[PDB]
Design a binder for this molecule. Structure first.
Ligand SMILES: [Ca+2]
Ligand SMILES: [Ca+2]
Ligand SMILES: [Ca+2]
Length: 676
DNA sequence: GTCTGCATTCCTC
DNA sequence: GAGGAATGCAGAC
């Protein structure tokens, strides 16, 4: 037998890896259960002709945030031991268990989000940091999803990433010798017959089968060079699709990307560099100090890097002296030593970022801007980072005492301090009338950070955490309603730190799905789980569940708000629909009505038998929930004790159905004890 | 209170 | 209208 571990943000992320494996592997025998209270498992027996294989995948939902807050040891430390100095966390880490320790096989990130401008590089930090470790990095992104107007939930123009984003993964792969790739899965809203923007998209770009093949080959310890080349070719084909759809006068053409790809030129020595300039777009509301003046100086000497409006460009060594002179004149820089450092004879990449929102809170997308530059032109390139967003007084005080202290606590400052050779600030200060100008020669500091690795030591995560939280409530709820209770369906599942999944409803042999679910609802709140049961009542049951660590965490009227959220989505035509036999997704045509279903709400939480009959009555009064699911762990022997408390006779019929049908041929129901 | 994970919306060319 | 810039949220530290 071979044992693998799937460390994920939550149970849903872990299960997505299993679903990829299961899509290509047709197992003979499948067993599910728990190895510990927090860790579910899937044990499969499959064959490749005459060759049988026995694998077990132990899932570890919830990564550590500090060092030993959830698990006894952090699996992410194995990445920091190999050079991953950014605390960017992937969605999943797959490990192999050999000689009493774990060994990373790959890191996976799932992104459904709209690739709208800077959202495309928001998570480039994890690709950069994990990519420089030698462990493979796979970025799976849904192509395509539409943006909605929210006023009436109608569709707006499709959003595509800049061609340089998919390309950065290919260039980081070449520079490091590692496998870092962007893979595209067919989204439900990919409807080329209806949208002219997709007329020239090659459907061979989709990588569902190749991602499954790659994972299985890695698990089997086989040569993945061929699969890697197929995946790199699809990433290159996406660069072709995107670059051939943009105006060539301000963006790189496919011929330019191809010449960099085949090794004819490097991105900074392209013979055509300069045909377009770097022209950073700054909103009027973001302007302050001498920022507009600095931007004019950059546009006087810059050459465009990939796109004229990307937040970075190049100042060639031939123009560096004049650019530095102009910056010195603008900001009154007169120190001879500083000027000599700035005038080094090499090409300089200038990156201009706001960095901070009006309240001083850091911009999440900006954390990936320097990693994007480093992935395209190599981390060794000289980077001049200009910041103009508002700083909290505490941040500017740390900049003047120890910039590394600020980088230690904040991820945006960590991105800036790790990859910038020069850090220039022209920032407003919260509580002050005018801007602060700073020029930090960060060259030696950057060099030291690029060679930093944490203590070398083996890691084997103990399957029992420090304590059981909301993620464990979600794992238990997911296991019960998705694997144990029959004729069930998981339309919605949003555990702590989860993706924007969407809601699926099955009715009359069709599956209807709402995508791009907004968090803001006038009368409702998005449920953490929506379970559909069709063989209990004449009308299908939709059970909306909100999970918390404690019963007191259930907000007032949460039960009513969950129902109102479902009613809110029913007021709009589903985004997509498909037949259960056909399987081909189409745009939604017919509307769904709430009275065609029985809507119930439930609150799930951990309680160590501290709730009396009157306490349950008070929770029902506060929340308005139709059902309360009190969960408690028993340590000796390990078991999850479940107590179902119904408010009304409809919920009581559901409870009796769960009790009678708490039996499975796949899931080990022996790990649970249902009190009632 | 702030982390950093998750996003959709705003604004300039 | 194209496409980056700019904005906020949440559970557990
Ligand atoms: Ca995540
Ligand atoms: Ca994700
Ligand atoms: Ca929740």
């Amino acid at each position: 037998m071979n044992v693998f571990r799937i460390h994920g943000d939550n149970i849903i992320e872990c299960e997505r890896v299993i679903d990829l494996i299961l899509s290509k592997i047709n197992p003979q025998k499948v067993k599910r259960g728990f190895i510990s209270l927090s860790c579910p498992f899937i044990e499969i027996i499959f064959k490749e002709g005459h060759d049988y294989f026995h694998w077990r995948f132990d899932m570890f939902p919830g990564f550590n945030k500090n060092t030993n807050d959830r698990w006894n040891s952090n699996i992410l430390d194995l990445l920091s031991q190999k050079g991953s100095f950014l605390y960017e966390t992937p969605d999943v880490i797959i490990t192999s268990l050999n000689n009493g320790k774990e060994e990373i096989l790959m890191a996976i990130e799932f992104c459904s989000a709209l690739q709208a401008g800077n959202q495309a590089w928001q998570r480039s930090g994890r690709a950069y940091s994990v990519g420089r470790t030698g462990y493979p990095y796979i970025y799976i992104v849904d192509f395509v999803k539409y943006e909605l107007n929210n006023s009436d939930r109608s569709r707006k123009n499709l959003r595509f990433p800049n061609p340089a984003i998919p390309y950065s993964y290919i260039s980081h792969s070449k520079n490091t010798g590692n496998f870092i790739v962007q893979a595209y899965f067919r989204g439900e809203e990919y409807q080329p017959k209806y949208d002219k923007k997709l007329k020239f998209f090659d459907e061979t770009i989709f990588a569902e089968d190749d991602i499954a093949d790659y994972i299985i080959a890695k698990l089997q310890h086989r040569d993945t060079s061929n699969i890697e080349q197929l995946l790199i070719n699809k990433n290159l084909k996406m660069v072709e699709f995107l670059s051939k759809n943009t105006k060539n006068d301000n963006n790189f053409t496919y011929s330019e990307w191809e010449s960099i790809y085949n090794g004819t030129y490097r991105i900074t020595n392209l013979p055509s560099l300069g045909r377009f300039k770097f022209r950073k777009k700054i909103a009027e509301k973001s302007l302050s100090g001498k920022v507009k003046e600095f931007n004019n100086i950059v546009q006087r000497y810059s050459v465009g890097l990939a796109s004229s409006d990307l937040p970075f460009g190049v100042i060639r060594k031939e123009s560096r002296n004049d650019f530095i002179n102009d910056v010195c004149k603008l900001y009154n820089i007169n120190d001879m030593k500083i000027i000599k450092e700035l005038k080094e004879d090499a090409d300089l990449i200038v990156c201009m970022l706001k960095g901070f929102k009006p309240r001083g809170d850091d911009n999440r997308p900006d954390r990936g801007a320097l990693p994007l530059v480093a992935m395209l032109a190599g981390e060794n390139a000289q980077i001049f980072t200009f910041i103009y967003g508002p700083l909290i007084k505490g941040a500017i005080n740390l900049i003047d005492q120890d910039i590394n202290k600020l980088a230690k606590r904040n991820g945006l400052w960590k991105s800036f301090v790790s990859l910038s050779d020069f850090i220039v600030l022209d920032c407003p200060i919260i509580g002050e009338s005018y801007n602060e100008f700073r020029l930090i020669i960060n060259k030696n500091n950057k060099e030291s950070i690029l060679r930093k690795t944490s203590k070398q030591q083996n890691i084997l995560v103990d399957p029992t955490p420090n304590h059981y939280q909301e993620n464990d409530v979600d794992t238990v709820i997911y296991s019960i309603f998705k694997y144990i209770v029959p004729n069930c369906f998981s339309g919605m599942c949003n555990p702590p730190g989860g993706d924007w999944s969407g809601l699926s409803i099955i009715r009359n042999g069709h599956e209807f799905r709402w995508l791009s679910l907004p968090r803001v609802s006038e009368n409702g709140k998005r449920p953490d789980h929506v379970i559909q049961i069709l063989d209990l009542f004449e009308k299908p049951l939709l059970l909306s569940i909100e999970s918390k660590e404690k019963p007191n965490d259930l907000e007032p009227k949460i039960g009513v708000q969950l129902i109102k959220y479902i009613e809110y989505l029913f007021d709009f035509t589903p985004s997509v629909q498909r037949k259960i036999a056909g399987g081909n997704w189409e745009f939604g045509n017919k509307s769904l009505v709430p009275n065609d279903f029985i809507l119930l709400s439930a609150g799930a939480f951990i309680d160590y038998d501290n709730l009396t009959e009157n306490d349950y009555e008070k929770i029902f009064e506060v929340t308005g929930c139709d059902l309360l699911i009190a969960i408690k762990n028993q340590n000796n022997p390990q078991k999850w004790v479940i107590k179902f408390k119904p408010k009304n006779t409809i919920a009581e019929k559901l409870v009796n159905y769960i009790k009678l049908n708490f039996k499975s041929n796949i899931f080990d129901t022996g790990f649970f004890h249902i009190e009632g």
